[PDB]
């Protein structure tokens, strides 16, 4: 039996937690888990977003029903990002400015597929109308009947739980995480050790033996998954691995955060979390029953923290000497490799990416999956190792190029902060998607029904940033394509049969705003 | 209006009437289709073999129903590639040799998809008990109920049409052409000219204006698609395109093929397509109603036209003095851009494989799909172009591998022939595919009840030609309940194997169903 026999996790929080859950189930108690834990002061809860595969690939996994995880983490549902004023100059207001053309200063990247006639997307179909001044309409609102019952704040679910629209979440890490310890611990055998860790044994090769924590005691095992966040204190720190700084792609690097407390009764409640452009950087909105989390993304080299601070304050009207925030510099890259030896990263320890589409908890989720599946025994096999590290090398630059382009292609110029980001370069592969775009051709075009792709891991993790994302982006910014699709000139029955399609739209997202709930009242009755 | 207003598509047969049928569809009569075709001389049928998305990709888009086309081309089904002898050395046999371990040297390709448990495909479980001595089924007749279906050569449809498998075609190809050029004729409005061509017509920047034809008749185009076959009239000849020679991946050349007349109410039909094995090269056999059509593909280096004849004839004992025989010479590769300015190279003209995986119909099929998408207006966006181009040289430079697998990972070493597939060099790609099997990793794991050689189907070849993992998928020791599962499983496909062997027709009798 030369089998893995010990796990140890390095840290908690959702990253450590959500590892040792998983890995409780994927390896059916053949396998001890340990995580190592240093205590800390409960932060404030700046709330956390996420993508609609959560419940299947991770909760439903575990066998845990959605309803109970989101009482116990006040979660609230999402239907999209929503940016506001990432067109517009000005300080950064909550409220969305008015284009030269009209338009107020919002568009939306929703979670459908889009439906298509004669093999050809309905984003091309209306892209072919746009250019041709056939409508006025925005393709978020053409194209997605999300798009209406967004604006009308209606729930994505009737109050008998039928669902009505594809949606993800919004939630309290740190309640999430405690969920999850709990699960673990009562349910999965897992051993909590409270501690800090003090020195990392190796052997001769460099691969890790056992930990110290603060109070003398050896943690001995055969895996380490390093979920300690951006020290990295196993990958880094103890086995040296160098992490590639990618702030020649993105500028932002701090953030400074809070939660508001929120009149839902009176206002409602956003089914979306909203990307809020600033003068330099954006301004987080994730809604929860009672309070909104908010954090400013900023860049440093082109505000101090104290004027990070102000605008943030301003933004919400808050008190900025009688308000509670946390302040974080990040770091944006990803390690060389993201296993080495018996060492496997998790989370911020392996790499990040600012929340700016909601990429962390699916990072977190995408490795363990990939972990399990490459699960190595004792001889840990080189092929297995180098083949993890592929997957979250091309899942990070893959995302990491697409929130490249909402700042490349914002046509902001007027802080030096948007102004800075047109001197980057881009990377080649959007350099090439654009190109693609711009001749009217679709970008990584879904060959799934939307069931398959958010019900199976492997349909979304190799198409993860489909055509629809592209459109949402690009034609959200301005971006459009020198042309329509030349196909659709020969194709006057296709252009018919979409017609159809867009008016199924209209009368989907009308019957839907009459009909669906509240997010607030749906909200009321699920947490009680 | 800046459209292409005449599409003119020189040459006939598969490639031209397939291009002609889809486009008359694709462009809604809003452009003039018109097709040069050489009245040729009606060659003996050879027989060709297709994979299972014909239906889907081509004909239902056409509206044509399986059944109608069926009839008026002699069509039978296919399950597989059956492969015999590409272990064992010898002269070729259609009987199979014994391997070692007392299975027959056959190893099936089928269409079925493996099933999971765990989020881990059958095949996997099956690996692990294979290489922890559990299990001394092969491959194929554990994981796929197809396997037992084929070996009592029963049909993929019952008598009243329900489907029990998928399944692809075999059909006559100057029958199916003929057929979808009465189609396109009478119900696409394409115009046929029967004449040759004599000139190309080029203007200054090297776009082609019009074909000259022998009866001084002028066919004036805006876009012009080659499936004029190997000479590639067009894309070689007149655009000056270089075609890259990939005889360094794939060594066969030749071929020479005939039909044979087959006693199915004797022998049955078989509901597949066999590969079988001989010294230079190997042997198609692709059943159809009353004949099956056979080619033996082979290498000029390592055998003489009259060699592969002679031994050709001797497979199925035939007189090669009296034997109608069709012999032909391949360039194996594509060109180096399979579009350029205003002419797209379609089948043969644009890129050619051994029909060792039936890869042909699908290759044409393919390329009018992604031209319809593509499709230009006067002033040829060279992005269009490129993005064609691309998608012709992934699709043809995959399946190249994938072939060449299948030659590379054979044991056989006893023929020149043979042992000169271990000089080749194999592709990057393919080398890292093998090395993730190696390692007992899913390569290219299917998503869905882009991705075209998946997990499967790597699996059939490599394990049927006995390349194993080093060890099984480390993760299946940390899974009992996922283990247990899976046996669950492998009997599910016993099940349904023995209850469809008992209940389906033989491929005989759905034949005679279908085509009386
Ligand atoms: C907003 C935030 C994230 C996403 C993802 C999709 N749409 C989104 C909208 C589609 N699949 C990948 C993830
Ligand atoms: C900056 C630095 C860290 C973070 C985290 C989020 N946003 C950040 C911005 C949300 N997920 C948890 C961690
Ligand atoms: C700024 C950016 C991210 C965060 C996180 C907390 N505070 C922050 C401040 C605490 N919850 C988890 C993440
Ligand atoms: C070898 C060379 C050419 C061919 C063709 C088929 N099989 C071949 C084998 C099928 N019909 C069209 C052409
Ligand atoms: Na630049
Ligand atoms: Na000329």
């Known amino acids: ?221 055969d895996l380490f998954v390093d979920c300690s966040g951006f020290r990295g204190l196993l990958i880094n720190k103890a086995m040296e691995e160098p992490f590639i700084d990618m702030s020649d792609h993105l500028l932002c690097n701090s953030a400074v955060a809070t939660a508001v407390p929120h009149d839902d009764e009176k206002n409602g409640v956003e089914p979306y979390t909203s990307s809020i452009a600033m003068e330099a950087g954006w301004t987080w909105k994730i809604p929860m029953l009672g309070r909104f989390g908010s954090g400013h993304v900023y860049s440093d080299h082109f505000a101090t923290q104290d004027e990070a601070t102000l605008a943030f304050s301003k933004l919400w009207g808050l008190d900025p000497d009688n308000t509670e925030f946390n302040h974080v510099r990040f770091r944006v890259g990803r390690n060389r490799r993201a296993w080495v030896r018996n060492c496997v990263s998790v989370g911020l320890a392996s790499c990040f990416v600012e929340p700016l589409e909601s990429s962390g908890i699916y990072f977190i989720y995408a490795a363990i999956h990939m972990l399990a599946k490459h699960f190595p025994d004792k001889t840990f096999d080189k092929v297995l190792v180098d083949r993890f590290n592929r997957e979250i090398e091309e899942m990070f630059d893959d995302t990491r190029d697409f929130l490249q382009a909402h700042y490349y292609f914002s046509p902001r110029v007027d802080t030096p902060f948007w102004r800075a980001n047109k001197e980057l370069k881009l990377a080649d592969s959007i350099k090439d998607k654009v190109e693609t775009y711009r001749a009217g051709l679709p970008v990584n075009l879904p060959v799934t029904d939307e069931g398959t792709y958010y019900g199976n891991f492997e349909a979304e993790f190799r198409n993860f940033w489909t055509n629809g994302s592209y459109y949402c982006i690009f034609a959200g910014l301005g971006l459009m394509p020198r042309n329509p699709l030349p196909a659709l000139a020969y194709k006057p029955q296709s252009i018919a049969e979409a017609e159809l399609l867009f008016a199924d739209v209209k009368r989907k997202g009308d019957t839907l705003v009459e009909s669906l709930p509240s997010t607030y009242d749906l909200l009321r009755q699920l947490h009680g």
């Open 1 to 221: 039996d030369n089998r893995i026999k010990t796990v140890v996790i390095l840290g908690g929080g959702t990253a450590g937690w959500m590892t040792a859950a998983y890995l409780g189930k994927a390896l059916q108690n053949t396998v001890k888990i340990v995580v190592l834990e240093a205590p800390t002061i409960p932060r404030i809860g700046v709330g956390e977003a996420t993508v609609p595969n959560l419940q299947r690939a991770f909760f439903d996994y575990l066998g845990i029903p959605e309803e109970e995880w989101m009482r116990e983490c006040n979660a609230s549902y999402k239907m999209a990002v929503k940016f506001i004023n990432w067109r517009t100059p000005g300080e950064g207001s909550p409220d969305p400015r008015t284009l030269d053309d009209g338009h107020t200063d919002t568009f939306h990247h929703p979670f459908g597929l889009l439906p298509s006639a004669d093999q050809i997307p309905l984003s091309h179909y209306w892209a072919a109308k746009r250019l041709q001044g056939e409508t006025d309409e925005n393709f978020d609102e053409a194209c997605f009947a999300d798009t209406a019952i967004m604006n009308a704040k209606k729930a994505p679910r009737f109050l008998d739980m039928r669902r009505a629209t594809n949606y993800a979440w919004h939630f309290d890490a740190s309640k999430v995480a405690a969920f999850l310890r709990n699960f673990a611990v009562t349910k999965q055998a897992v051993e909590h050790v409270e501690d800090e860790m003090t020195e990392v044994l190796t052997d001769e090769r460099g691969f890790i033996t056992a930990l110290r924590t603060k109070s003398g005691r050896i943690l001995q095992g």
